[PDB]
Each structure stands twice: as C-alpha cells, then as structure tokens.
Amino acid sequence: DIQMTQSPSSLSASVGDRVTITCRASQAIRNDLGWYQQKPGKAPKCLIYAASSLQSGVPSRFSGSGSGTEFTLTISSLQPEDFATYFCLQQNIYPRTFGQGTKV
Amino acid sequence: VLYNLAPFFTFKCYGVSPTKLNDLCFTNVYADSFVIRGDEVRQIAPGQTGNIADYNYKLPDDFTGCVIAWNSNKLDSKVSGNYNYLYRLFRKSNLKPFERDISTEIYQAGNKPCNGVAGFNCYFPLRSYSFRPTYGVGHQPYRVVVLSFELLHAPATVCGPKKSTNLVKNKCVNFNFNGLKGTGVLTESNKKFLPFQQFG
Amino acid sequence: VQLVQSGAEVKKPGSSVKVSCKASGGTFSNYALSWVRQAPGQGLEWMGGIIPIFGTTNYAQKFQGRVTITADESTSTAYMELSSLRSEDTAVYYCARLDGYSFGHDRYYQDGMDDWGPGT
Amino acid sequence: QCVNLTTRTQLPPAYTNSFTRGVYYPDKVFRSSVLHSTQDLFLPFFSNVTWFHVIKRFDNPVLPFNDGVYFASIEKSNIIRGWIFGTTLDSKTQSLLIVNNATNVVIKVCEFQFCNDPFLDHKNNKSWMESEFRVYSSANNCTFEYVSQPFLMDLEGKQGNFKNLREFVFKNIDGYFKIYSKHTPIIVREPEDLPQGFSALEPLVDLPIGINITRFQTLLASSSGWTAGAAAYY
Ligand SMILES: *[C@@H]1O[C@H](CO)[C@@H](O)[C@H](O)[C@H]1NC(C)=O
Ligand SMILES: *[C@@H]1O[C@H](CO)[C@@H](O)[C@H](O)[C@H]1NC(C)=O
Ligand SMILES: *[C@@H]1O[C@H](CO)[C@@H](O)[C@H](O)[C@H]1NC(C)=O
Ligand SMILES: *[C@@H]1O[C@H](CO)[C@@H](O)[C@H](O)[C@H]1NC(C)=O
Ligand SMILES: *[C@@H]1O[C@H](CO)[C@@H](O)[C@H](O)[C@H]1NC(C)=O
C-alpha cells in the first residue's frame, strides 16, 4: 500500500462557518474516494460515497468538492450535532487515514 | 412535434434555438437512444462532468444539436425490475466524442492483469440498471434522443415544413413559387406545359 | 439489511480471538463484508472483505496469514479468526456492506450502506 | 466475393458516327416557338462514339468518366441493367451504384470494395435469375440510399427483334447527379445502323450525391459459363 494524509484535527469554528476538511491523494480516481463519519462511542455512518455522488439519509450541510489529488469536505452551517470523526477512503485495497473533527 | 407535448421536460439547447430550425437546411440528421437515471441527464449535457460523461459518452462542449428527455415511469419502468440496460463505468483513459465501444473485456484494479472470473480487484465494466417505478426522483428512466446537425459538402436534403399560402387570382401580388420571386397578377392560362418543366 | 456483531473474548494473549457478523435481512452476495478497526487512539485500516459466492482472500499488508475471514454459503454470518493476540491490535471491529460489483440480482451498483455492528 | 470469370478475348471496340442523337433539355423552362442559344456540356453532332456489342463475346471494360456520358442501348434481351462506378472502388472512396433489376431502382452512395471483374451475369448455363449479384464485398460507410420506381423493361432474354431503343445521358454538375432518358419503342433497326432521327432526352430524377467521379463501368445480366443474346450499345 501507499500512504496518504488527511486534514488536521484543529478545525474550530462557530455556528455558520465553512470548513475545509482536506483528503490528500496519490492516484487519479473519482468514485473510489469517499467520506465516512464515526461518532465517538456511537453508531457510524457515511458522509459521501464519492465526490459527485451523495447518500440518502444525510442533511445537506455535508458537501464534497474537488477531483484532483485533494478532496475537500465543507459544512454550510456548522452545528454542535456534527461532532464526529471523519475519515477518507481511497484506492482498491482501501488504506484509510486518521481523522478527528471537533469544534473547540 | 418537438416543441409541444410538455411531458418532454428538457427544452434548453446549446447550438441553435429550436424555434429557428425551420429554415437553414442541413445535410442529414441523426437519432440516438439513451436510457439514463435522473442525475445522468445533466452529465450528458455539455459543460458537465459525471459518471456517464467520461466513461460512456463524452459529448463535445459545443456542437450543433441538443437533447430532449421525458419522464418514462409508465413506459420504461417495470415492477419486476428492468435489468436489460447496461453501462460502462470502468474506463482507463478519457473519451473522444462520437464513437461506440462494444468491448466485452474485464477491468482490473491492481497493477497486474487480473482476468478470469470477477471478484475483488477484477470487475466487469458493464453494470446492470434496475428501473422499478417505486424509486424516487433521480433513478427514473429519462429517454434521451440527441440530434446531429452538419453542413458537409453536399446538397442539402433534410428540411422543415414549407409555408404555402392561398391562391389569389386577378390581383397584384408578389408570388414566390418554388423560390422564384416576382411581381404581377396571376391569371388562368391555356398553355400546355410538359410535366418535365415548371417555368415558362 | 443490518449487521450484528458477536461479543468480545479474553484480552490475555496466547489465544485466538473469534468474531462473527450476522447480516439479518437481504440475503445477497458478492458485496464484500469489509472489516475495519476503529479506535479513538488509532486510525482505520482495511482488514479484509469476505464474499459468500466467491470466497477470495485478498488482504492488505502486514497481517497476511494472521487473519482468516470466511462465511457461509450465502450472506448469513461471517466468521473472522485472529491469532497471536498482542497489545497494539486492540480496537473495535466494524463490518460494513461496501459498494462494488454484484453478480446476483444485478440491480444496484450503489445500493446504499445502512448496516453497522453495535460495537464489541 | 467474386469469381475470376477470365477467358476474355481481346476484341477492340468499334467506332460509330453519332449523327444527330444526344440532345437533352438543359433546364426546366417551357418555351413556345422560340429559338434558344445555350452554352452547355453537350454531345457534338456527327461524333465518334465507341461501340460495344455482346452476343460469345463478353464486353464490359473500364471506361474513363469526364463530366457526361451518352449511353445508347439497342437490344431486346435487355441484358443491360445498371451502372456501377466511382473512382478506385477499394473501400477507400465513395462508390455509386444504379441497379434496376426487377422491381427496385437502387441508388447506393456507399463504401464498397469492388472486384476487378464485376457483373450481374452468369448462372445456370444461361438461366437469368437473382444469384451472384453481390459483386460488392461488404458495406462499411453508406452515406445515401434511394429506391425508385422501375422503368419499362423486358423479361428474360431473346435474340433479335431490336425494337427497344434506350438513350441516357449522365452528368455530375456541382454535386448533383443528373440523368436524362428517352426510351423509344418500335424502332425496327435490327441490322446495326444507329438511326438518323431527332428526339430530345427528358429528365427522370436528380440525385443529391455531392462527390467527384473519375471512371465509370456498366453491368450485364458458374460465374463463367452462360449464353447471351444479341445486344449493342454505344
Ligand atoms: C482474381 O484473383 C486475384 C488473385 O488470385 C484476386 O486478387 C482478384 O480479386 C480475383 N478477381 C475476382 C474478380 O475475384
Ligand atoms: C472516327 O470515325 C470514322 C468513321 O465514322 C473513322 O473513319 C475514324 O477512324 C474514327 N476516328 C478514329 C480516331 O478512329
Ligand atoms: C427490391 O428491393 C426491395 C428493398 O427491400 C426488396 O424488398 C424487393 O424485394 C426487391 N425486389 C426484387 C428483389 O425483385
Ligand atoms: C441449364 O440450367 C437449367 C436450370 O435448371 C437446367 O434445367 C438445364 O438442364 C441446364 N442445361 C443443361 C445443358 O444442363
Ligand atoms: C464516411 O465518409 C465521410 C465522407 O468524407 C466521412 O466524413 C466520414 O467520417 C466517414 N465515416 C466514418 C465512420 O469514418
């Protein structure tokens, strides 16, 4: 496997701010990228299946953008209910990368 | 027929406005058959990139012609599952416009060629649709027929309807019979034209 | 479809830990049941995906042969055995219905994942 | 796929004095008792036309095209059926096909790999039929198809009694393929002697094809092995 990085954990903002959660990549793939969420001590879920595809069962705050070597997640209106840890999915073997989303 | 029947939802066009297509005759016209989901209609249209735009068909960003789609929840939608439709989502390179690929090979995810039967890191590029009417907006079949306009070095043979007015006799008018313009009155004549000519 | 994980085992080393994910509802195959390690102190990584009808054993790096994932004939329950218990491998195991090629009913490439283990 | 019929002897074609034949209406304009001096691509009066005859003798050679052909057939077996022509005919160019056999007039503007020896003859000794017709190999780039009403023709073949006289002219003017025709009966002119009569040629159709043409070739209808009737053309 080949390694990649993700956004830093120090992204703190108030209500109604845009976040820039960045997933850095190494290969040119479109649908194989994904954004998942894991609440601490609660049930996990997904955020986006790809950059150009969404899921049924999410609020419209979570949005994805970019198609190059980095993929950016953005929240239109930040709320305390989105306290979860976000992780990025790449490539065929799926080497996943660390992530931590907390507003403080 | 293209303008009316308001169930034809798509009406915006790129090259030429549809109401001005009566004149400006072309060489020949073409018709296609695209059965796609709700999200894939905008990706077919030029200027947009999607999962159907770079792996199935890459329309040019500027071309003479456009698409018209309609809701087909009662025609192409079956309660038992409409599994015949297939599409390619696994293409290694980009797409040139105006060609078809009917390859029945296998797609690999690793560096080595996988081949054989499918499984992990070895996927068939052709994936089957399912178009039951119980699904919501975004998966219903919208049939897309794109038209082609070209001005190749041949005499034009595809045209529109021709405007013919009533016949006025013994009055000073401006006749335009078969593109022959003129001025005068029109009277009944005793002349015997052969059927092989139109002017005297 | 909903995935329910079995309980944990003894923390002491020298033994093999066994886990099982039961996929209640939606008896479907060729969707690989991806196992992933979740912990607050470490990141996630792919441990393996089991397919009922094919049964391929494509794994990731650094744990080839330490883990064995198998299943029944179709959907049902999926077993995972891990030997050589240690201190840095402790996490919670999550089984997910990851999107991919299906050779069964052939209806959705992206069916939608709505199944997760309770967490043991 | 074609069969090399071969066994073709080398008889040079004859020469005939075209006295007053080869006149057509140059435009679709009606005129009453006037005289019109036009400047157009015509056939000269009292010219040297090339004479082919088919009896034993297989005459179907390659002839060059230069913006107008006057084809005059005197026959009763009606072995002449169409014209297949183009430039190279090797599926690298546009090829034109005018075939009227029984009930269709096929105008084909397509891409054909044509054979070096092409005809709609010869099957079951001399039994006229519809076999060995696919002289073109296959169609790849077809640009135009047209089906039109058949002309007044004959059935099978017979030797002698040369009543039917067909006159055609073909031209390729600024893309349009223009043909003009005159089919006159009861011309009792069996022993050769291209008649000294005046009759203008009237248009039939006009094809919007739009290519350039270098050489042309006619057609006639066990690829080698048939007995044909007496027929002549110029
Ligand atoms: C005759 O034979 C040659 C070579 O054997 C071939 O190239 C040619 O096409 C044949 N002619 C016909 C009319 O089949
Ligand atoms: C033209 O025809 C005449 C008779 O009609 C003939 O004598 C003459 O040889 C012909 N010209 C040529 C070049 O053969
Ligand atoms: C002429 O061509 C048409 C085209 O389909 C065909 O239907 C018809 O049978 C043909 N006539 C014949 C072979 O006599
Ligand atoms: C020529 O072909 C016809 C067609 O069946 C046949 O009846 C006839 O006997 C053939 N001629 C000879 C000499 O065999
Ligand atoms: C068929 O011939 C025309 C004539 O130039 C050409 O423009 C066209 O590209 C050809 N078709 C194909 C598929 O190449």
Residues from chain B that touch A53, judged by Cβ atoms under 8 A, are 39, 51
| Closest chain C CA to residue B107 | C101
Cα of D92 vs centre of ligand 1, distance in Å, is 18
CB spacing of A45 vs C116 below 8 angstroms: yes
Residue D4 covered by a domain: no
Query: Which of B145, B157, B155 has its CA nearest to residue B13?
Result: B145
Instruction: Identify the chains in contact with A, defined as 3+ C-beta pairs within 8 A.
Output: B, C
Cα pseudo-dihedral D154, D62, D133, D227, rounded to 10: 60
Q: Could you tell me where the DSSP H helices lie in A31-104?
A: none
Is residue D131 in contact with ligand 3, taking CB distance under 6 Å? no
By the 10 Å C-beta count (0-12 exposed, 13-18 middle, 19+ buried), B122 is classed as buried
Cα of B139 vs centre of ligand 1, distance in Å, is 56
**Number of A:B CB contacts under 8 A?**
12
Looking at the CA of D141, which ligand is closest? 5
Contact in structure between B34 and B43 (CB atoms under 8 Å): no
- Token readout for A31 is 């649908």
Torsional class of A95: left (φ above 0), alpha (ψ -120 to 50), beta (otherwise)? beta
Breaks (C-N over 2.5 A) in chain D follow: 55, 221
Residue C51 C-alpha, separation from nearest chain A C-alpha, in angstroms: 15
Cα of D50 vs centre of ligand 2, distance in Å, is 10
Task: Give the Cα separation of D51 and D13 in Å (integer).
Answer: 6
Task: Give the Cα separation of B178 and B103 in Å (integer).
Answer: 50
Q: A52 — contact with chain B (CB < 8 Å)?
A: yes
Is residue D15 in contact with ligand 2, taking CB distance under 6 Å? yes
Contact in structure between D70 and D220 (CB atoms under 8 Å): no
Cα of B192 vs centre of ligand 3, distance in Å, is 37
Residues from chain C that touch B83, judged by Cβ atoms under 8 A, are 105-107
In degrees, to the nearest 5, what angle opens at C-alpha B26 toward C-alphas B99 and B44?
35
Contact in structure between C38 and C94 (CB atoms under 8 Å): yes
In degrees, to the nearest 5, what angle opens at C-alpha B12 toward C-alphas B6 and B15?
140
Residue B121 C-alpha, separation from nearest chain A C-alpha, in angstroms: 7
Cα pseudo-dihedral C63, C65, C69, C70, rounded to 10: 170
CB atoms within 10 A of CB C114: 15
CATH code: domain of residue A36 = 2.60.40.10
Is residue D127 in contact with ligand 4, taking CB distance under 6 Å? yes
What values do phi and psi take at B43, rounded to 5?
-75, -30
Domain of residue D66 covers 14-234
Determine which of A5, A29, A32, A96 to mutate to test the interface with C (most C C-beta atoms within 10 Å). A96
Instruction: Identify the chains in contact with B, defined as 3+ C-beta pairs within 8 A.
Output: A, C, D
Q: At how many Å resolution was this determined?
A: 3.0
Task: Give the Cα separation of B117 and D31 in Å (integer).
Answer: 79
Task: Give the Cα separation of D233 and D215 in Å (integer).
Answer: 18
Atom of ligand 4 nearest to the CA of D126: 1
Residue B122 C-alpha, separation from nearest chain D C-alpha, in angstroms: 35
Atom of ligand 1 nearest to the CA of D117: 13
In degrees, to the nearest 5, what angle opens at C-alpha B29 toward C-alphas B25 and B34?
145
Q: Which amino acid is at C9?
A: E
Residue D44 DSSP one-character state? P
In degrees, to the nearest 5, what angle opens at C-alpha C34 toward C-alphas C29 and C40?
155
Residue B44 DSSP one-character state? H
DSSP string, B93-114: S---SS--------EESSSS--
Contact in structure between D2 and D118 (CB atoms under 8 Å): yes
Q: B118 — contact with chain C (CB < 8 Å)?
A: yes
The domain made up of C2-97 is a member of CATH 2.60.40.10 = yes
Task: Give the Cα separation of B155 and B65 in Å (integer).
Answer: 20
Query: Which of A7, A9, A5, A8 has its CA nearest to residue A25?
Result: A5
DSSP string, B132-191: -TTS-TTSS-EEEEE------SS---B-----------SS-B--EETTEE--B-------
Residue whose CB lies within 8 A of the most ligand 1 atoms, among D3, D4, D5, for a mutation test: D4
Of A40, A46, A87, which is closest to C44 when you measure between CB atoms?
A87
Strand partners, D106: D99, D147
CB spacing of A31 vs B109 below 8 angstroms: no
Residue D123 covered by a domain: yes
What values do phi and psi take at C68, rounded to 5?
-135, 120
Residue B152 C-alpha, separation from nearest chain A C-alpha, in angstroms: 38
Contact in structure between B9 and B71 (CB atoms under 8 Å): yes
Query: Which of D35, B54, C98 has its CA nearest to residue A91?
Result: C98
By the 10 Å C-beta count (0-12 exposed, 13-18 middle, 19+ buried), D131 is classed as exposed
CATH code: domain of residue D55 = 2.60.120.960
Atom of ligand 1 nearest to the CA of D2: 14
What values do phi and psi take at D84, rounded to 5?
-120, 125
Residue whose CB lies within 8 A of the most ligand 3 atoms, among D104, D128, D155, for a mutation test: D104
User: For residue D141, how far is the Cα from the chain centroid?
Assistant: 24
Q: B94 — contact with chain A (CB < 8 Å)?
A: no
Torsional class of D78: left (φ above 0), alpha (ψ -120 to 50), beta (otherwise)? left
Chains A and D touch (3+ CB pairs under 8 A): no
Beta pairing, strands D144-148 & D231-233: unpaired
Task: Give the Cα separation of B90 and B52 in Å (integer).
Answer: 11
Atom of ligand 1 nearest to the CA of D3: 14
Contact in structure between C96 and C22 (CB atoms under 8 Å): no
Only one residue has tokens 């609020």, namely: A59
Residues from chain D that touch B189, judged by Cβ atoms under 8 A, are none
In degrees, to the nearest 5, what angle opens at C-alpha D92 toward C-alphas D90 and D98?
65
Beta pairing, strands C33-38 & C46-50: antiparallel
- Non-local CB neighbours of D202 within 8 Å, separated by 6+ positions: B194, B196, D24, D25, D180, D181, D182
- Non-local CB neighbours of D59 within 8 Å, separated by 6+ positions: D11, D13, D52, D53
- Non-local CB neighbours of D224 within 8 Å, separated by 6+ positions: D3, D5, D6, D7, D122
Task: Give the Cα separation of B87 and B55 in Å (integer).
Answer: 9
The residue count for chain D:
234
- Count helices and strands in chain D by DSSP H and E runs: 0, 14
Task: Give the Cα separation of C100 and D3 in Å (integer).
Answer: 55
Expt. technique: cryo-EM
Domain of residue A90 covers 5-103
Contact in structure between C102 and C1 (CB atoms under 8 Å): no
CB atoms within 10 A of CB C72: 11
CB spacing of D176 vs B153 below 8 angstroms: no
Task: Give the Cα separation of D176 and B173 in Å (integer).
Answer: 33
Q: Give the H or E element holding residue B69.
A: strand B67-71
Q: Give chain D's domain count.
A: 1
Contact in structure between D200 and D219 (CB atoms under 8 Å): no
| Closest chain C CA to residue B85 | C107
Determine which of B51, B56, B89, B90 to mutate to test the interface with A (most A C-beta atoms within 10 Å). B51
- Token readout for B165 is 């007015």
Cα of D97 vs centre of ligand 3, distance in Å, is 15
